[PDB]
Amino acid sequence: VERIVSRDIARGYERIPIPCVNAVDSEPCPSNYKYVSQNCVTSPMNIDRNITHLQYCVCIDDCSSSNCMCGQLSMRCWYDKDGRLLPEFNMAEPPLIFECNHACSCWRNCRNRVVQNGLRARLQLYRTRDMGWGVRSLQDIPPGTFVCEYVGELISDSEADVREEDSYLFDLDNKDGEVYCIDARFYGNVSRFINHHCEPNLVPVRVFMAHQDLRFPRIAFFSTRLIEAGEQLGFDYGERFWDIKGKLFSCRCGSPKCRHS
Amino acid sequence: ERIVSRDIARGYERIPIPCVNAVDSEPCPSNYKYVSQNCVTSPMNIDRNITHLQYCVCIDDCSSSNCMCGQLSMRCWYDKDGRLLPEFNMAEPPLIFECNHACSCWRNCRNRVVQNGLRARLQLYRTRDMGWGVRSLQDIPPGTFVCEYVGELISDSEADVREEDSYLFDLDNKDGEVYCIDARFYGNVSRFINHHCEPNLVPVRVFMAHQDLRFPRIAFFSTRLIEAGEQLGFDYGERFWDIKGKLFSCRCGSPKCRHS
Numbered sequence: 001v002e003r004i005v006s007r008d009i010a011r012g013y014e015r016i017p018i019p020c021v022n023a024v025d026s027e028p029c030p031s032n033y034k035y036v037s038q039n040c041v042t043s044p045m046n047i048d049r050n051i052t053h054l055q056y057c058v059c060i061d062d063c064s065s066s067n068c069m070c071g072q073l074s075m076r077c078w079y080d081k082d083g084r085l086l087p088e089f090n091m092a093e094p095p096l097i098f099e100c101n102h103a104c105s106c107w108r109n110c111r112n113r114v115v116q117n118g119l120r121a122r123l124q125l126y127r128t129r130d131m132g133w134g135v136r137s138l139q140d141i142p143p144g145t146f147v148c149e150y151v152g153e154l155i156s157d158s159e160a161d162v163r164e165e166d167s168y169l170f171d172l173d174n175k176d177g178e179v180y181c182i183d184a185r186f187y188g189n190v191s192r193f194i195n196h197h198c199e200p201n202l203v204p205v206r207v208f209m210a211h212q213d214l215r216f217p218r219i220a221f222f223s224t225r226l227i228e229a230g231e232q233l234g235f236d237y238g239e240r241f242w243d244i245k246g247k248l249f250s251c252r253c254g255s256p257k258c259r260h261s
Numbered sequence: 262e263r264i265v266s267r268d269i270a271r272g273y274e275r276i277p278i279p280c281v282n283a284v285d286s287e288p289c290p291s292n293y294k295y296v297s298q299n300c301v302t303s304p305m306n307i308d309r310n311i312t313h314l315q316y317c318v319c320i321d322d323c324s325s326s327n328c329m330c331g332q333l334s335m336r337c338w339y340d341k342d343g344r345l346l347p348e349f350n351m352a353e354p355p356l357i358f359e360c361n362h363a364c365s366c367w368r369n370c371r372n373r374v375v376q377n378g379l380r381a382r383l384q385l386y387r388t389r390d391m392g393w394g395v396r397s398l399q400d401i402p403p404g405t406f407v408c409e410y411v412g413e414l415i416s417d418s419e420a421d422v423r424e425e426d427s428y429l430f431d432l433d434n435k436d437g438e439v440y441c442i443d444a445r446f447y448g449n450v451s452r453f454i455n456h457h458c459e460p461n462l463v464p465v466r467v468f469m470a471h472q473d474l475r476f477p478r479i480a481f482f483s484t485r486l487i488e489a490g491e492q493l494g495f496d497y498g499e500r501f502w503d504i505k506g507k508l509f510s511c512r513c514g515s516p517k518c519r520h521s
């Protein structure tokens with residue numbers, strides 16, 4: 001017997017509502033945080049917004065040709081006609097995706113635009129048995145489909161070293177030393193409730209849209225396979241997360257190939 | 262009336278914005294880049310600190326007297342249809358503060374209009390005496406948000422070095438700081454709106470995602486009923502005419518014209 005603890009945690013900010021349900025305990029809909037559907041900042045981030053620094057395409061079509069600068073920047077356009085990733089997409093070692101932007105001569109409905117169109121999957125925040133809150137899909141999601149962005153507060157590396165709660169962090173590591181993270185503890189979208197899984201049905205991909213400042217990629221989760229309606233969403237948190245949390249608790253992921261229990 | 266474009270915005274607006282010409286044989290303008298939202302070339306350190314935003318904690322649709330966001334703008338001037346109340350002072354607009362992502366209310370509350378985008382069927386057309394112009398293709402009730410003046414966000418000293426100043430809009434309040442929106446190289450439909458001494462459009466300074474006073478956004482609202490086919494217009498102000506006045510005189514044709 002699952003009780004509806006919220007009609008939509010996003011409060012209309014997403015294209016579709018994201019309900020919350022409980023059928024495990026008496027815990028109420030989470031509220032010790034603020035829902036934001038887009039990345040925000042506290043301390044000012046020097047993101048390069050210079051519109052003339054943007055690289056862009058001058059296509060006269062729907063950006064399906066190999067001449068599209070944006071596709072070239074992404075090595076090639078990885079989206080098919082339905083906005084899904086092509087099969088020859090390296091899920092184990094994702095390339096950076098550069099979607100068309102407002103500087104491109106193309107139309108707002110060209111092919112190289114997917115993450116920028118927001119959430120299009122009916123998800124649901126629900127209470128699990130062991131991991132607490134989790135997220136699941138109320139519909140079938142085909143492989144290579146864009147599901148959700150990992151949205152939170154943009155903070156510096158050092159800023160990350162002075163925060164008690166660090167279970168809601170995503171590193172945007174760069175061999176440039178210039179390292180940043182997205183902390184969804186205080187500010188975050190539905191992704192902050194996604195749990196870890198060793199054989200994840202979601203893989204994070206670095207995407208670039210309105211700007212192309214490589215220090216600040218936005219994280220878009222794509223389905224690594226067919227996800228069945230009712231299935232819980234999951235993604236690999238990575239070695240740093242477990243390398244520090246692996247000293248506090250074991251991985252309740254329950255995967256036959258699990259790598260952190 | 263030849264159709265030179267099905268949509269100059271290329272799909273970036275909620276509705277398309279066609280472009281026609283039944284005068285000369287000039288093609289759809291293209292010596293500029295259309296942008297549905299403000300942009301910057303040189304950096305502008307807009308205060309985007311989310312903890313700096315003021316907001317409301319309303320448990321309703323922000324249509325009560327306790328919405329803090331409404332109080333900031335003295336009161337919420339929007340009605341259930343998103344139109345400005347009859348008591349709104351067109352000749353002396355107040356600063357409007359729409360609800361933002363920091364508020365506790367829902368994304369569909371009453372205090373959100375300009376952040377919702379273009380919803381009036383407009384059209385860029387070729388006029389006979391003022392070059393290009395924007396007209397309405399539908400009746401537009403008074404107090405209706407029509408469009409925003411979007412362009413390049415530049416400083417005072419920067420606009421001061423730009424020879425071409427026909428597409429500049431001043432955002433002032435001296436204190437060592439004063440900014441403009443240059444729509445010459447980057448702008449939306451509003452760049453094609455011609456001047457009029459008895460305008461059916463009035464600029465209103467609005468704040469939404471951020472509340473950095475140096476950067477209000479310019480929202481145009483109808484000052485009266487605008488019927489289908491009528492050309493849009495707003496007062497360019499004194500600085501514009503004090504300058505461009507030395508070259509040509511106004512041609513709005515208003516019996517009460519103040520610059521011809």
Ligand SMILES: COc1cc2nc(N3CCCN(C)CC3)nc(NC3CCN(Cc4ccccc4)CC3)c2cc1OC
Pocket residue numbers: 157158160161162163164165166167168169170171179181237238240241242244245
């Ligand atoms: C990927 O998931 C995680 C990413 C995390 N990233 C960081 N960063 C800050 C320091 C490393 N920097 C190079 C990368 C960003 N810190 C993290 N945690 C910090 C939190 C503050 N603590 C303070 C501290 C230091 C030493 C001993 C005890 C406590 C240091 C580790 C994370 C934790 C994560 O999983 C929990």
Ligand SMILES: COc1cc2nc(N3CCCN(C)CC3)nc(NC3CCN(Cc4ccccc4)CC3)c2cc1OC
Pocket residue numbers: 417418420421422423424426427428429430431439441497498500501502504505
């Ligand atoms: C509202 O419409 C206008 C606003 C304009 N604003 C400005 N500003 C810059 C100086 C005054 N400052 C306080 C307000 C913003 N300059 C303006 N024009 C300046 C541009 C630079 N020129 C000098 C120039 C000439 C040739 C080449 C380079 C520069 C002097 C007039 C405008 C003009 C406008 O109508 C045309």
Ligand SMILES: Nc1ncnc2c1ncn2[C@@H]1O[C@H](CSCC[C@H](N)C(=O)O)[C@@H](O)[C@H]1O
Pocket residue numbers: 131132133134167168192193194195196197250251252253
């Ligand atoms: N595979 C896994 N096994 C055990 N706990 C997990 C897990 N994946 C995520 N978690 C738990 O959830 C935190 C990640 S944040 C996800 C939200 C969380 N389940 C909640 O109810 O708020 C971790 O610190 C951990 O406590």
Ligand SMILES: Nc1ncnc2c1ncn2[C@@H]1O[C@H](CSCC[C@H](N)C(=O)O)[C@@H](O)[C@H]1O
Pocket residue numbers: 391392393394427428452453454455456457505509510511512513
């Ligand atoms: N009432 C008016 N009388 C004469 N010229 C006007 C005018 N309103 C606008 N303009 C003309 O347009 C410029 C403002 S920008 C508006 C766009 C312009 N009509 C175009 O076709 O690109 C002015 O410098 C002037 O040349």
Ligand SMILES: [Zn+2]
Pocket residue numbers: 057058059062063068069070071100104106112
């Ligand atoms: Zn292209």
Ligand SMILES: [Zn+2]
Pocket residue numbers: 056057058063068069070099100101104105106112
């Ligand atoms: Zn492009």
Ligand SMILES: [Zn+2]
Pocket residue numbers: 057059062063100104106107110111112
């Ligand atoms: Zn494109």
Ligand SMILES: [Zn+2]
Pocket residue numbers: 196197198251252253254255258259260261
């Ligand atoms: Zn596991």
Ligand SMILES: [Zn+2]
Pocket residue numbers: 317318319322323327328329330331360364366372
């Ligand atoms: Zn309110």
Ligand SMILES: [Zn+2]
Pocket residue numbers: 316317318323328329330359360361364365366372
């Ligand atoms: Zn509010």
Ligand SMILES: [Zn+2]
Pocket residue numbers: 317319322323330360361364366367370371372
């Ligand atoms: Zn509100």
Ligand SMILES: [Zn+2]
Pocket residue numbers: 457458511512513514515517518519520521
């Ligand atoms: Zn006049």
